[PDB]
Amino acid sequence: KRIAIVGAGQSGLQLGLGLLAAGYEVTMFSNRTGEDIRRGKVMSSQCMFDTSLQIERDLGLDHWASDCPTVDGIGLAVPHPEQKGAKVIDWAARLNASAQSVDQRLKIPAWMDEFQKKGGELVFKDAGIDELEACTQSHDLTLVASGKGEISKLFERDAHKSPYDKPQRALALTYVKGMAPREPFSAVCMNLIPGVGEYAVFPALTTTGPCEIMVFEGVPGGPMDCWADVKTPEEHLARSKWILDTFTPWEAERCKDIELTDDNGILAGRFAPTVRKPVATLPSGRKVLGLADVVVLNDPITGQGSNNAAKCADTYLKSILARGDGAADAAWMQQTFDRYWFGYAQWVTQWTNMLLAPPPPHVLNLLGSAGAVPPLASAFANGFDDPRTFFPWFADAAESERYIATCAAVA
Amino acid sequence: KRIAIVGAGQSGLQLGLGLLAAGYEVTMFSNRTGEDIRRGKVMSSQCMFDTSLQIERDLGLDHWASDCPTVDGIGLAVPHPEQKGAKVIDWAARLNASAQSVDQRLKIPAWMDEFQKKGGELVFKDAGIDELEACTQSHDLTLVASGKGEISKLFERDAHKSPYDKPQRALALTYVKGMAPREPFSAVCMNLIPGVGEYAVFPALTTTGPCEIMVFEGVPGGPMDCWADVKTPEEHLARSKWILDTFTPWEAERCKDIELTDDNGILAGRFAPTVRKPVATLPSGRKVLGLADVVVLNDPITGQGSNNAAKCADTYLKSILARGDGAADAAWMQQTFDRYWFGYAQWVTQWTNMLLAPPPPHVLNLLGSAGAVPPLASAFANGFDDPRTFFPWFADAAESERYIATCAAVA
Ligand SMILES: Cc1cc2nc3c(=O)[nH]c(=O)nc-3n(C[C@H](O)[C@H](O)[C@H](O)COP(=O)(O)OP(=O)(O)OC[C@H]3O[C@@H](n4cnc5c(N)ncnc54)[C@H](O)[C@@H]3O)c2cc1C
Ligand SMILES: Cc1cc2nc3c(=O)[nH]c(=O)nc-3n(C[C@H](O)[C@H](O)[C@H](O)COP(=O)(O)OP(=O)(O)OC[C@H]3O[C@@H](n4cnc5c(N)ncnc54)[C@H](O)[C@@H]3O)c2cc1C
Ligand SMILES: O=[S@@](Cc1ccccc1)c1ccccc1
Ligand SMILES: O=[S@@](Cc1ccccc1)c1ccccc1
Numbered sequence: 001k002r003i004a005i006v007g008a009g010q011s012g013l014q015l016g017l018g019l020l021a022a023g024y025e026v027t028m029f030s031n032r033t034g035e036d037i038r039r040g041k042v043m044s045s046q047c048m049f050d051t052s053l054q055i056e057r058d059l060g061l062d063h064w065a066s067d068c069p070t071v072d073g074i075g076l077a078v079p080h081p082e083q084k085g086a087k088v089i090d091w092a093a094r095l096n097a098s099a100q101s102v103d104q105r106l107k108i109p110a111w112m113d114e115f116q117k118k119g120g121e122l123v124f125k126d127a128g129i130d131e132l133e134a135c136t137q138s139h140d141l142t143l144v145a146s147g148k149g150e151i152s153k154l155f156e157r158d159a160h161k162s163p164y165d166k167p168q169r170a171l172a173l174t175y176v177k178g179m180a181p182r183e184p185f186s187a188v189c190m191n192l193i194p195g196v197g198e199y200a201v202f203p204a205l206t207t208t209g210p211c212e213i214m215v216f217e218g219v220p221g222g223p224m225d226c227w228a229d230v231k232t233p234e235e236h237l238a239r240s241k242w243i244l245d246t247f248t249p250w251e252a253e254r255c256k257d258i259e260l261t262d263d264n265g266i267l268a269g270r271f272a273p274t275v276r277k278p279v280a281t282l283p284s285g286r287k288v289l290g291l292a293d294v295v296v297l298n299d300p301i302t303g304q305g306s307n308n309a310a311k312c313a314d315t316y317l318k319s320i321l322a323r324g325d326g327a328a329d330a331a332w333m334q335q336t337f338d339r340y341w342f343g344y345a346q347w348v349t350q351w352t353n354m355l356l357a358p359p360p361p362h363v364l365n366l367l368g369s370a371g372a373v374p375p376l377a378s379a380f381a382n383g384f385d386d387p388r389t390f391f392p393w394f395a396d397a398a399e400s401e402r403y404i405a406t407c408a409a410v411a
Numbered sequence: 412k413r414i415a416i417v418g419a420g421q422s423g424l425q426l427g428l429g430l431l432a433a434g435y436e437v438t439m440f441s442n443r444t445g446e447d448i449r450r451g452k453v454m455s456s457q458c459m460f461d462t463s464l465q466i467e468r469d470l471g472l473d474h475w476a477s478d479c480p481t482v483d484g485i486g487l488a489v490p491h492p493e494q495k496g497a498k499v500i501d502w503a504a505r506l507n508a509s510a511q512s513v514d515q516r517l518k519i520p521a522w523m524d525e526f527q528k529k530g531g532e533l534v535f536k537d538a539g540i541d542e543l544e545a546c547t548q549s550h551d552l553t554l555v556a557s558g559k560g561e562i563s564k565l566f567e568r569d570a571h572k573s574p575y576d577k578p579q580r581a582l583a584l585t586y587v588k589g590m591a592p593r594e595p596f597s598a599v600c601m602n603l604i605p606g607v608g609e610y611a612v613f614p615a616l617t618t619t620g621p622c623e624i625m626v627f628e629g630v631p632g633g634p635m636d637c638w639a640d641v642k643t644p645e646e647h648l649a650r651s652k653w654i655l656d657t658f659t660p661w662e663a664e665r666c667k668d669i670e671l672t673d674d675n676g677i678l679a680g681r682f683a684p685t686v687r688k689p690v691a692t693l694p695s696g697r698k699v700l701g702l703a704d705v706v707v708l709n710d711p712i713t714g715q716g717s718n719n720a721a722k723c724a725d726t727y728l729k730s731i732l733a734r735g736d737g738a739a740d741a742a743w744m745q746q747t748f749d750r751y752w753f754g755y756a757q758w759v760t761q762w763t764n765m766l767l768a769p770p771p772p773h774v775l776n777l778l779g780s781a782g783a784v785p786p787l788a789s790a791f792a793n794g795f796d797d798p799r800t801f802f803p804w805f806a807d808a809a810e811s812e813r814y815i816a817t818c819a820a821v822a
């Protein structure tokens with residue numbers, strides 16, 4: 001009934017807090033102080049859809065639900081190749097229930113505070129193998145929940161579940177104040193720039209209050225792979241506006257008076273999508289279990305990492321509670337991951353990895369048809385809450401045409 | 412905020428009770444009295460796994476949880492072709508959480524009583540088109556939850572989702588007292604008789620207390636398609652013992668003193684697996700929405716119909732609550748079904764329909780390997796709680812060999 005978790009992030013803290021509430025003793029390692037997280041760089045755009053939000057609600061952890069702006073739909077626009085400044089696709093659909101984006105700079109430090117208040121043992125150290133060897137002698141189970149930290153590479157890359165070994169997009173985030181609110185409802189406003197990349201923007205809550213988060217993804221080497229020469233926050237804001245002016249002038253109209261929320265409300269980087277084997281064996285021969293981004297890491301193009309992290313921690317918590325006094329051996333660890341992967345994450349991952357590649361004709365047809373077939377637009381919007389619902393019609397041309405027909409018949 | 416439901420069965424009553432608890436007005440049509448259901452023929456073997464049981468718990472509807480025997484694992488046996496009376500495969504695995512089988516003869520009438528007590532309007536009539544036309548003028552939404560009743564055929568068969576148009580098994584149930592309990596834990600004891608059929612048995616709760624339910628499925632025309640000449644309860648019990656004596660003598664050893672729980676604790680029949688389109692249009696042009704077995708009907712070989720019914724009613728209830736004052740139009744109806752189908756039921760249905768066909772070599776290899784690889788046996792057992800977790804390794808030979816390797820590595 002003693003659990004150790006290395007890494008104080010979304011999944012690790014959600015799990016630790018749920019374990020404490022169930023009467024477990026929990027040790028957690030953090031490599032940063034709460035205040036340094038609050039005031040440091042942004043980490044995510046963390047748009048969480050209703051199913052993930054509800055996992056938090058059910059643990060009593062939705063502390064910002066009233067203050068965080070709701071995200072009430074999804075929109076998709078595509079520039080018109082033959083009409084300057086216009087869109088050839090431009091539609092939106094309401095989400096059946098609101099999404100919300102609460103800055104991890106707010107959430108993770110507040111959850112660290114709650115974790116201590118509820119009796120967790122928070123240990124401050126940049127943990128390595130030595131700490132894992134110690135934890136595995138004093139605890140019944142040790143999890144690594146370290147996200148994109150270097151220690152995550154202790155787990156073996158799963159080549160068969162990882163089609164990519166290089167970054168597929170150049171990423172940037174810009175948190176801003178002063179953006180014209182979307183009317184008549186808020187949305188994830190997605191912009192697909194063929195052969196170039198993607199821009200998405202939606203309202204969120206950060207450390208200085210409500211904002212909007214601009215999310216940029218660029219095909220590497222293309223016109224939106226444009227962050228290498230950006231060296232200051234001012235240059236970052238300027239490059240953000242330049243992208244909108246150049247590729248999505250309809251969005252630039254909302255941005256005449258935007259400012260950064262704070263100089264650390266910016267990010268640029270890239271990584272290869274990666275799936276890893278969940279059980280790592282230490283030099284001693286003892287074993288540790290990987291959680292969330294340690295074992296399933298996706299590009300943010302589908303906005304699923306934090307959703308995955310909440311759903312992964314829920315599955316792992318349920319598995320721990322069901323195990324009782326049973327051994328937390330490698331078999332149990334593997335079966336816990338397997339339920340997450342085969343039951344859910346394989347479909348999130350396959351969908352995301354397909355979207356990173358150039359869209360085949362049947363996908364462009366789906367995106368266009370959604371603008372004239374509102375049930376299909378709704379299927380797209382609410383698929384973000386459970387990407388299993390995209391299969392098999394998103395990936396297969398013949399199935400896509402059947403689903404368009406089903407949607408048109410009830411429009 | 413007025414909902415009508417035609418058919419007082421598992422899904423219809425679960426949904427109606429959840430709607431009443433959320434403040435809706437609910438009208439329900441039943442074609443039988445509660446007492447006639449209690450004392451009539453059995454309808455199911457209704458083995459419900461933990462996720463389905465939890466849906467009921469969360470609605471406060473688990474009224475028999477303490478009295479119903481738990482089912483704590485799954486076992487699989489296959490007769491040895493070259494050793495008389497022996498098994499070439501014989502293994503078991505524990506379920507991570509208990510399953511339970513509460514006779515629908517107990518549950519449905521008790522839930523009808525609760526439905527009235529909680530303010531539902533229970534109307535007694537064999538409902539037809541006229542009642543649906545009336546309901547759709549006086550209610551905001553009308554659902555058909557009539558199971559295998561004739562009115563279910565109002566919904567159009569979905570040929571593309573229905574690979575079969577004929578029964579694939581001859582079915583029978585026998586509820587008995589006096590069976591030797593399984594030691595050291597209870598289980599769904601499955602017996603696969605190659606080219607002949609399947610026998611499964613597990614403990615349950617019926618109207619005279621704890622029992623075991625014998626479940627027989629026979630390839631049509633084969634040795635276990637053997638119920639046509641059975642005309643009395645005594646002949647039914649005798650034919651049940653004959654199957655065990657002939658094909659599974661190890662199970663017959665537990666059955667030396669079995670008796671029927673009651674003369675109506677028997678069933679024999681068959682049906683074609685069928686998927687239907689969820690929106691039916693009445694002569695008036697008004698529309699009704701199908702629920703559970705009306706739109707997704709599977710053979711019982713995987714024991715999923717009641718599980719599907721609980722999960723379907725949960726999805727539909729969530730969709731209704733999220734809709735608020737939004738129109739309950741055909742688009743919303745279709746999207747509600749689509750989330751159930753693409754998110755979940757398509758995988759239950761594909762798995763079940765594959766199992767009805769003769770097993771390919773890689774499946775026989777999986778079943779044999781599970782006897783020597785306990786993590787793989789556990790994957791099989793707990794897959795019954797969420798059949799999504801069988802994909803893609805159950806259906807594809809190359810993926811099956813990868814998963815066997817994953818399991819063996821942590822054994
Ligand atoms: C640009 C960007 C945009 C995104 N947008 C979205 C979005 O809109 N929606 C969405 O759902 N997801 C989004 N994500 C993904 C989401 O942010 C992550 O998937 C989520 O944070 C995963 O949670 P986790 O618990 O696995 O890791 P994290 O929350 O990253 O936590 C890991 C923690 O462990 C710490 N750590 C690392 N190494 C060690 C060590 N050795 N010892 C101790 N601590 C250590 C790290 O510092 C970090 O604090 C986005 C990601 C990026 C990069
Ligand atoms: C032999 C057998 C064994 C099974 N074993 C299992 C098992 O182990 N595990 C499992 O999970 N599932 C099992 N099932 C499946 C499970 O019993 C059903 O899938 C489940 O009952 C579906 O619930 P439902 O609400 O859709 O329909 P039901 O529970 O069948 O309810 C439909 C109700 O509507 C009534 N009705 C019909 N027509 C009308 C009308 N015109 N007006 C009013 N009322 C009407 C019917 O009389 C019935 O009472 C089994 C099924 C069979 C046949
Ligand atoms: O992370 S962005 C995905 C993206 C889109 C466009 C340009 C960059 C990134 C997101 C967030 C929530 C829901 C959907 C998308
Ligand atoms: O309905 S039986 C399936 C079956 C097996 C063997 C012979 C007949 C039928 C069941 C119940 C719960 C879980 C698994 C199987």
Ligand SMILES: O=[S@](Cc1ccccc1)c1ccccc1
Nearest residue numbers: 076190191192198301302355380
């Ligand atoms: O990839 S296309 C457009 C796009 C996707 C994600 C972020 C930005 C743009 C898509 C759009 C909606 C639903 C599924 C896929």
Ligand SMILES: O=[S@](Cc1ccccc1)c1ccccc1
Nearest residue numbers: 487601602603609712713766791
């Ligand atoms: O169809 S085979 C054997 C069998 C299945 C179902 C009812 C009786 C026997 C199987 C066994 C376990 C898990 C998946 C498939």
